[PDB]
Subunit: 283 residues, 4 copies
Amino acid sequence: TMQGFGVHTSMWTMNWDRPGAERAVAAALKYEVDFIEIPMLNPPAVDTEHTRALLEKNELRALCSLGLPERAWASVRPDAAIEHLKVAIDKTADLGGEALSGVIYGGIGERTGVPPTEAEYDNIARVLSAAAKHAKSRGIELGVEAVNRYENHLINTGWQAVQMIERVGADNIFVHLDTYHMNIEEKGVGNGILDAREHLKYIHLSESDRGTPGYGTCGWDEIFSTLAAIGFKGGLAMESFINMPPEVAYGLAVWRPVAKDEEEVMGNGLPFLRNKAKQYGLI
Amino acid sequence: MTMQGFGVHTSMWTMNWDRPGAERAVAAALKYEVDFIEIPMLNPPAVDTEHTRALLEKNELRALCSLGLPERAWASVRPDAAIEHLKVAIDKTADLGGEALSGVIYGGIGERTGVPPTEAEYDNIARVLSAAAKHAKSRGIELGVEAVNRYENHLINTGWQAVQMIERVGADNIFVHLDTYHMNIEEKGVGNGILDAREHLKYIHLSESDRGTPGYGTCGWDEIFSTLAAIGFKGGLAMESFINMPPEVAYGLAVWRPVAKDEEEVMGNGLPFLRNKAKQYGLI
Amino acid sequence: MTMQGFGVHTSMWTMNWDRPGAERAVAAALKYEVDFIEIPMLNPPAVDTEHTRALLEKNELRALCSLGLPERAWASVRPDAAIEHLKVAIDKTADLGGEALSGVIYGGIGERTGVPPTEAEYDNIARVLSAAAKHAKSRGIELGVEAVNRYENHLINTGWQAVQMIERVGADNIFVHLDTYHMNIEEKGVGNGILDAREHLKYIHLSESDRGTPGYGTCGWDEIFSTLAAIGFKGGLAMESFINMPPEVAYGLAVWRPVAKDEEEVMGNGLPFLRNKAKQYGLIGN
Amino acid sequence: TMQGFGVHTSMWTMNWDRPGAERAVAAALKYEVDFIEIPMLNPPAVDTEHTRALLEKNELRALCSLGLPERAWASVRPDAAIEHLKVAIDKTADLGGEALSGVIYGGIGERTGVPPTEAEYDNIARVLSAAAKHAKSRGIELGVEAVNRYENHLINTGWQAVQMIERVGADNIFVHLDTYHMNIEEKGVGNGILDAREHLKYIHLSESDRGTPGYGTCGWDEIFSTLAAIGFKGGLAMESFINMPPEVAYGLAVWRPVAKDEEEVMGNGLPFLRNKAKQYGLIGN
Ligand SMILES: O=C(CO)[C@@H](O)[C@@H](O)[C@H](O)CO
Ligand SMILES: O=C(CO)[C@@H](O)[C@@H](O)[C@H](O)CO
Ligand SMILES: [Mg+2]
Ligand SMILES: [Mg+2]
Ligand SMILES: [Mg+2]
Ligand SMILES: [Mg+2]
């Protein structure tokens, strides 16, 4: 039921330790967002009580996201993926999060060199069924983020994400789209939204170069008009890679700055997105 | 009006719907393999309804008709004459096998007071459209209200204004008719016209921003088609270009120079572009 | 002229260029840190040039003027009346410190014969603009010819037509003025107007497709800004949004409903957008 | 001097073997393009005089493209890279090709895990200088194609490619842009064209998902307006991986069909692109 505008906290914190959480919440207040997305690079280390109290005091909602580490890629090590996800689901639920989303079906860097196979998808479906039931037991939902061909060869489009949701058969898994990935993957950016429309509950609003929304190659008018047209009432989450911790950035093929500074990205990008949301009547 | 698929406004071959003109237009429709034609009715009384009916039926073609009111019958100021004009056009549309009368049926090209539209004007329009809608209902057809840009008419320029008139009238057989060329000027983001009209949108003119070749101008086609798909549009996708319009009609529409090279450019590049986009975004 | 940087057509802030309106406009221009304002020259005898000049120099603002000709002086058909009107307008522009007189200086906003333009009309215009260009030269200012859409004028609608008139007149102090709202209607791909006009282009109205807030309509801004960067554009970038409507051109401009909530929404959201695009595409001066 | 429209032959054949050359040249003539772009991925395996005969016979021009294999990535193994490029240059010359372009400076799929270093660019520059001399020896030019961050970590933007061209100092190396790559890397697609304007001689007009141009997220009006604005006069080349050369498949990451078939891409994409070139008055159209 995540609604309104939010921010992926990577711009201030990929390490969700005590000072990092305080720093991200502080930013969230400064930009008057409705929610934050909390990356969980190391779920066991998260202080759930601190974060809960922070979200409650500051009347902020949250969800969490991750991508599977290689020791636990679901396509090939599903039992370890289930174990990794159960820990992340519990931490998410305990800190007050409403969903765990992201690359929860695999990891950044998976690539076999040939098309995804039924054996791989079978393993993913088994992992997501296990994890969805655990999520349900803690009262949260799972999100599946479609990412571009280079990061993962399994779920790149909204239509692929929907197929996996159908193969799993749960009711608490939604699609999570990201405009930067859709800019590469969708045959017309609106088609990712169209194909996912029955399951789309969250979208990363990111520019085509991970810099400043409004200043790249994404078709924002098409994106926003199509979200309004399908009655999108889910989470509008700004994602930019500015000020990413270096080794995490290098993991995402950031070889060079995506933008001048946080003042360019947040000062120009959030108003652009909020303005478009008002323009097309998502508010 | 259940009109569906692709069609063409026949102005590229005929603005005078006489006997050879109707045959010329139907011949074009077959060549480009469209599902329906839009028949301009510049002079409704002169239309041979039986000839056109037979032609549509024999060739498996659907149709609607469209018009703008002449000044002697602008509805905002001369509603009684507007009603009389529309009744004749509605009867001719139904009798030729048409499923709707659409267009600038609420006023005319060239209305302008210099100030915002007034409630008195809208009251006269609503009375005309209510009378016309009743008459259309009795003949089994629907009416369409085409939003046009600020310079052609000062009364209905956006999808949201068109929906407000439909609500003011309260009929069930009036729909909205959008035109990408007018939306390109009037809508605050072109998809917003579709969004605002979504509960009433049954027909759209796919026209380029300069009235030339769709795909080669300033209209935002991906937003247009994505948004049509996203609202589940299943109405008429009608191509409109001003290529080869008769001069007098063209001058009345502010065509001061060619909109395109020739029909081969317009139909040969523009129709495939639009069919391709329709398939791309799943309207097909 | 040498106009560079960002400016605003003063309809953003006032309906007429009277003394209180000039006060209100210059004060608003200062809270946005623009480099110049564009002042309508619709009632030349009514402009208090000493008052305006003092305001401009005090607040270190540059200016130019624009107009459309009234029907009594449409150059198409009443060229001698047009020469006289333009001479008065030029003098007032020069007097108040403005650096150019631009816009629809060749005809009316809302001018239309009902038929395509003729050589007789273009010949009259050329004669008027030659005479007007000599008088501008005598007062130290330039003239601009703005292409406007088919519904506002039937004579010059595209960058290519504007350049053809500039080359027909053969003056050296007349430049082309484009407007993205008009190009959105007239140009077969918006960048083509910029390309066609590139050798004479010194000024552009960055106006949204519905005269509203730039960034929130149907104009193709990335194409516009990339093409302006590519041709080396170095002239004025001016906003034009009819928050207020000068009465003498209201009928031709056809703003029958609000273009935007208010001046704060257009300047607060549109100017940053435009400045940010100019910097994104590396526009000379940024 | 490549002018007009051409097609990268992955449109029609996976490998440039003898039957693939015959099938690609036949299709190229059916669509009346001016040139084809031939992958030079296994130089020893190319039958040059067979291809040369086909090209001359069918009044077709050609250039070659490649990415370097890991054994000869210029950034880490510069001497192997020089040797490999000389072999590829000689074969491109022998078959009548007029340039060797693409990722001639590195691998399709090359990544260290960290940003590029000066040591890497120093090696590439040395490689390209030597390669440029030998290309001149055989009378062809070299092209440097910027590719997106996921295929190479070294040259990703028009401005980076120009910086390497200025560093090497050679007269006969041009910049090669790709709209699919610029869709990801350029901060506004036209900026890649603007940044590379002094050296830009070749452009891949490739849709954002490698499918049919005109049916993705590439900003074609911006692309074509800016090309006209800078006076682009070089080659306009389609690139759609209907067929996937085996040696670069892992790096190009085409895991599902980019389009129905080569008829859909050529039948819809090429007229779209020819029509835009005419619309914006591109020199040669
Ligand atoms: O864009 C236009 C025409 O509609 C304007 O620049 C000029 O008419 C100025 O408003 C001069 O009055
Ligand atoms: O766009 C690209 C790289 O992704 C291609 O031009 C090159 O890889 C050449 O085709 C060489 O294979
Ligand atoms: Mg994301
Ligand atoms: Mg229409
Ligand atoms: Mg203007
Ligand atoms: Mg390429």
